[PDB]
Nucleic acid binder design. Structure first.
Ligand SMILES: [Mg+2]
Ligand SMILES: [Mg+2]
Ligand SMILES: [Mg+2]
Ligand SMILES: [Mg+2]
Ligand SMILES: [Mg+2]
Ligand SMILES: [Mg+2]
Ligand SMILES: [Mg+2]
Ligand SMILES: [Mg+2]
Ligand SMILES: [Mg+2]
Ligand SMILES: [Mg+2]
Ligand SMILES: [Mg+2]
Ligand SMILES: [Mg+2]
Ligand SMILES: [Mg+2]
Ligand SMILES: [Mg+2]
Ligand SMILES: [Mg+2]
Ligand SMILES: [Mg+2]
Ligand SMILES: [Mg+2]
Ligand SMILES: [Mg+2]
Ligand SMILES: [Mg+2]
Ligand SMILES: [Mg+2]
Ligand SMILES: [Mg+2]
Ligand SMILES: [Mg+2]
Ligand SMILES: [Mg+2]
Ligand SMILES: [Mg+2]
Ligand SMILES: [Mg+2]
Ligand SMILES: [Mg+2]
Ligand SMILES: [Mg+2]
Ligand SMILES: [Mg+2]
Ligand SMILES: [Mg+2]
Ligand SMILES: [Mg+2]
Ligand SMILES: [Mg+2]
Ligand SMILES: [Mg+2]
Ligand SMILES: [Mg+2]
Ligand SMILES: [Mg+2]
Ligand SMILES: [Mg+2]
Ligand SMILES: [Mg+2]
Ligand SMILES: [Mg+2]
Ligand SMILES: [Mg+2]
Lengths: 56, 205, 154, 129, 122, 80, 81
RNA sequence: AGUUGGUGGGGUAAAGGCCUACCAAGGCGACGAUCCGUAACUGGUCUGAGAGGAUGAUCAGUCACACUGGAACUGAGACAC
RNA sequence: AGAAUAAGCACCGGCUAACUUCGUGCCAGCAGCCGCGGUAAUACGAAGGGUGCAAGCGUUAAUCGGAAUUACUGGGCGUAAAGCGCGCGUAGGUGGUUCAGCAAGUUGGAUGUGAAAUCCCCGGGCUCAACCUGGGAACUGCAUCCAAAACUACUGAGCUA
């Protein structure tokens, strides 16, 4: 809960500084925890300055 | 559970003697027992009928030191029994083992008699009982274990029970600390200040 | 008799040019606890004066009630206005099982085992009227024996 | 349309004691006569007389004692729309037994105390106090 | 009514409807938060009440009140709702449970802090 | 011995059997009034000697068809 | 067949037994035909250890009821006294 | 429209439209048939002064079911957990 | 062996037992119903104090009660909701008054049944209680016989309000 709140605070501050971003929301299931963490880490550098991808 | 804490705010809040100390020195010269406890002590504050009934029930419960659920059980048993539940409740309360040990002079107060009973120092029919709720029947012989007959507590308790009034329903054999329960004490054997009608009124609502 | 119960105290108002005048009304019951009972109403601009007027009014017009040793003769059912009242004798161990004005009336009159109930409007003053109407028309034996001899009727 | 004449007897007696009268006259019947007889036996009325000539009339003399009627409350229990029947142990006690309740048993019309004494139930007819 | 009329047609009992149609006989139900916003109370009162739109597992979509002095609820957060309407707000029939799934409870509360999901300060 | 039922004849259009109506009077469970109920039974008339309106008595035997398990033993009130 | 056996009641580590006449293919504590006494493995004090109806037991044994091993031993002990 | 009753015959451990061939036109229903929805039933349990209201967890009796739809065989007993 | 190893939760404006200070200022918030909060808030948030319970305490959901608020026990319909616009009449409900009979309703008794457990009473065992258990009561009902004839029903014969 604490990490979620801190991330929300930082993201809200940055977004209000810039403007808005178009999110692509995905629900990701995997077979092993290592694969899940690798996918989550690798699907974070794919966004842009106007579009971004979120794992909900 | 058990109420453990200041055992004299209860007397001030109830406004009666409500014996909880040994009665050795006094009650007035320990707490100025004329004000309700707390900051707002000087206020009088006349209260309502429900308040009077609640105060009466609390006074009885704090006299005999039992909690609410056991007291409700006592009330249900008194209602179930025949003949005027009002004094049936007192008949049943006056037969508990800790109260009987207190009345026999083995303990100074109810808490100390509870201390004695719970710590395996009392035998009822020649065999050990340590439940401070055991309803003693007419004709039992409450005694003290031989390994527990040299405790001073009993000595001071007996010499101080020597002057509080004659119970006249238990015979204590002072030299070897053995008692006898002749019968339950009738309503006329207790103080005529408790208004048990208020208790029955409170629970019948 | 001297037993005072303050059944009710209330604040009423009337309107004139300028605003409102407040008055205090009190309803009380008086009795000796052994047969006699009366009720009184008193109005003033002060609560103590209204209560004293109610007590003085209630001390008059006392009535005598026939009762079977702190217990009613037979079940009674009495009405006044929209208020209805049921009463019936109870055994010795019972207390007063009644609500509000009825409890004060019955305790003052001297009955101790009444097991009562009220229906309809529960206006305290009308309940008091209904309770005295029930209690006053209570016959008791040796008076119902106006017809014939006694011990054969029962 | 005179669906029930015994309730008419009771109502005539009631309305006549409200009006402070001494005598009540009505058409007679073998059940009204029994009810009047038991009422007299209990002392609620002074006398009852029955005339001749095919249209006999019952005349009841009322008591007053003090400035109030002797018959305080009277009411018909088993109307032609209910027909209440009771056993021995379920017979009502009006006003703790101070009053009486009329019961028609197979032994005739009588009072609740007589029915309890005889161990007989029956048809509750009316109640008087 | 008469005995004949009652025999021909017995007296009928009217059923009382539940105040909380969602959460059908359940003490609580969980849902996902679709909107978080503030509303204005009714006429005699003035405030800015915190309310959230919740889609339940029943398929219902209701409005729930968020108690306390501060919260951290966003869209797509999972919450547990219970009964109890807010009289001041029209159309709000449910309450959000503080400290159950994603609500985290009120911070710095020290009196009655069991209706708000706050632990003992110790 | 053997217990019987007594009632009216309401139909005799069938062959070697009759329809009998039995009237009972039952106290209502809650409102206390006495209401009248009817029972319809199919009884066995061997020689077709019962006509509509007759008051007869019947007893119980083994089933003789479906919906027919009663047999009549006496005609006691002949119809007009 | 029809047997006479012990149905267990009482509580944990405190068993009480009813001597019951049952169709053999019933539950141990299920339906029965008749109870003909009881057995108390602990007893003590004023409690009796076992009691049986002689009349009913003899009647059922005469009708072809097979008692169990415990029922046989207890019944012969009761007949001994 | 085998629907309701009669007769001859078959069938069952056993009465019976249970089945079959002829004969008749009956049978049920405002004392609620048929249809629609809902639901295992009872001893009992919870409330209530009582009358009533609500309800069939654990315990005991009965019923029905055994992935879904049918059928029989073996057997004293199954249409077979 | 040593006091050694073990107390929290709700509430304090009225209903409803228990009150004051400090912050805030129609905000932040509270709330079961009335309702609180706009600069002295016993109602919001803390702190002191107090009141209920207590190895538990509160909240939510649900049933009955209070509700005589579906009123059989035990309510109403001139003006608060409630008499069809008014007749006639079918099923049904109800039935003036005398004899006589019958015995469906009705009343009394006997027999059988109404499983055990559960509820209740008197006892007995666990150190007490919960719990287990013996005997009794009850199961208010149903069926069959015997008896009674006031009332209702049915049958026959009358009388005129
Ligand atoms: Mg406990
Ligand atoms: Mg009202
Ligand atoms: Mg609520
Ligand atoms: Mg045939
Ligand atoms: Mg054919
Ligand atoms: Mg054939
Ligand atoms: Mg076969
Ligand atoms: Mg068949
Ligand atoms: Mg054939
Ligand atoms: Mg239908
Ligand atoms: Mg189903
Ligand atoms: Mg009630
Ligand atoms: Mg059901
Ligand atoms: Mg199960
Ligand atoms: Mg079962
Ligand atoms: Mg299959
Ligand atoms: Mg075979
Ligand atoms: Mg099978
Ligand atoms: Mg198998
Ligand atoms: Mg107060
Ligand atoms: Mg201030
Ligand atoms: Mg408040
Ligand atoms: Mg506060
Ligand atoms: Mg509730
Ligand atoms: Mg009701
Ligand atoms: Mg309610
Ligand atoms: Mg009514
Ligand atoms: Mg009304
Ligand atoms: Mg109008
Ligand atoms: Mg109007
Ligand atoms: Mg008109
Ligand atoms: Mg007609
Ligand atoms: Mg007539
Ligand atoms: Mg007629
Ligand atoms: Mg039983
Ligand atoms: Mg014992
Ligand atoms: Mg018995
Ligand atoms: Mg005769």
């Amino acid at each position: 809960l604490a990490r979620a709140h801190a991330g929300k605070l930082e993201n809200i501050f940055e977004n209000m500084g810039q403007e808005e971003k178009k999110t692509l929301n995905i629900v990701l299931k995997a077979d092993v925890r290592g694969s899940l963490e690798a996918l989550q880490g690798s699907l974070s550098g794919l966004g842009n300055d106007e579009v971004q991808v979120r794992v909900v | 559970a058990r109420y453990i804490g200041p055992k004299c705010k209860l007397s001030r809040r109830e406004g009666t003697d409500l014996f909880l100390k040994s009665g050795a020195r006094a009650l007035d010269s320990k707490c100025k027992a004329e004000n309700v406890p707390g900051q707002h002590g000087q206020r009088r504050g006349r209260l309502s009928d429900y308040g009077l009934q609640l105060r009466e029930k609390q006074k009885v419960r704090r006299i005999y030191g039992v909690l609410e659920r056991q007291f409700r059980g006592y009330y249900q048993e008194a209602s179930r029994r025949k003949g005027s539940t009002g004094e049936n409740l007192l008949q049943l309360l006056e037969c508990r083992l800790d109260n009987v040990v207190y009345r026999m002079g083995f303990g100074s107060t109810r808490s100390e008699s509870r201390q004695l009973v719970s710590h395996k120092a009392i035998t009822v029919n020649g065999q050990t009982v340590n439940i401070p709720s055991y309803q003693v029947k007419a004709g039992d012989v409450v005694a003290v274990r031989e390994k527990s007959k040299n405790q001073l507590r009993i000595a001071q308790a007996l010499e101080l029970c020597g002057q509080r009034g004659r119970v006249e329903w238990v015979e204590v054999d002072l030299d070897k600390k053995a008692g006898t329960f002749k019968s339950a004490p009738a309503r006329s054997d207790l103080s005529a200040d408790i208004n048990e009608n208020l208790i029955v009124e409170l629970y019948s609502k | 008799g001297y037993i005072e119960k303050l059944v009710q105290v209330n604040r009423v108002a009337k309107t004139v040019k300028g605003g409102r005048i407040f008055a205090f009304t009190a309803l009380t019951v008086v009795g000796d606890g052994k047969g006699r009972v009366g009720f009184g109403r008193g109005k003033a601009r002060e609560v103590p004066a209204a209560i004293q007027k109610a007590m003085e009014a209630a001390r008059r017009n006392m009535i005598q009630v026939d009762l079977n040793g702190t217990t009613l003769q037979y079940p009674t059912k009495s009405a006044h206005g929209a208020s209805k009242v049921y009463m019936q004798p109870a055994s010795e161990g019972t207390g007063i099982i009644a609500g509000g004005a009825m409890r004060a009336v019955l305790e003052v009159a001297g009955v101790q085992n009444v097991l009562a109930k009220c229906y309809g409007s529960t206006n305290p003053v009308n309940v008091v009227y209904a309770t005295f109407k029930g209690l006053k028309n209570m016959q008791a034996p040796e008076a119902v024996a106006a017809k014939r001899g006694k011990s054969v009727e029962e | 349309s005179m669906q029930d004449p015994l309730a008419d007897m009771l109502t005539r007696i009631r309305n006549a004691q409200m009006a402070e009268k001494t005598v009540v006259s009505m058409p007679s019947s073998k059940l009204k006569a029994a009810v009047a007889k038991v009422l007299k036996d209990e002392g609620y009325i002074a006398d009852f007389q029955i005339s001749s000539e095919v249209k006999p009339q019952l005349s009841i003399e009322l008591k007053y004692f003090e400035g109030k009627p002797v018959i305080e409350e009277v009411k018909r229990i088993s109307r032609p729309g209910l027909r209440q029947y009771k056993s021995v142990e379920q017979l009502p006690k009006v006003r703790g037994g101070l009053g009486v309740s009329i019961v028609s048993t197979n032994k005739g019309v009588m009072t609740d105390r007589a029915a309890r004494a005889a161990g007989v139930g029956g048809e509750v007819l009316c109640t008087v106090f | 009514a008469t005995i004949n009329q009652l025999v021909r047609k017995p007296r009928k009992r009217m059923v009382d409807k539940s105040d909380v149609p969602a959460l059908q006989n359940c003490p609580q139900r969980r849902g996902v938060c679709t909107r978080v916003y503030t509303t204005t109370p009714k006429k005699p009162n003035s405030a800015l009440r915190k309310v959230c739109r919740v889609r339940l597992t029943n398929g219902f979509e209701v409005s729930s009140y968020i108690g306390g002095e501060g919260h951290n609820l966003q869209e797509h957060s999972v919450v547990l709702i219970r009964g109890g309407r807010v009289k001041d707000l029209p159309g709000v029939r449910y309450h959000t449970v503080r400290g159950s799934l994603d609500t985290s409870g009120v911070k710095d509360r020290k009196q009655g802090r069991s209706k708000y999901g706050a632990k003992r300060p110790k | 011995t053997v217990r019987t039922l007594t009632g009216r004849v309401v139909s005799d259009k069938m062959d070697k059997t009759v329809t009998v109506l039995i009237e009972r009077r039952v106290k209502h469970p809650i409102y206390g009034k006495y209401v009248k109920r009817s029972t319809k039974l199919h009884a066995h008339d061997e020689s077709n000697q019962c006509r509509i309106g007759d008051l007869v008595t019947i007893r119980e035997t083994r089933p003789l068809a479906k919906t027919k398990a009663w047999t009549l033993v006496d005609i006691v009130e002949r119809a007009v | 067949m029809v047997t006479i056996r012990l149905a267990r009641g009482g509580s944990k580590k405190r068993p009480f037994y009813h001597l019951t006449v049952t169709n053999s293919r019933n539950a141990r504590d299920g339906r029965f035909v008749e109870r003909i006494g009881f057995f108390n493995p602990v007893a003590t004090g004023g409690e009796v250890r076992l009691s049986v109806d002689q009349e009913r037991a003899t009647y059922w044994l005469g009708q072809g009821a097979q008692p169990s091993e415990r029922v046989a031993q207890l019944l012969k002990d009761a007949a001994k006294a």
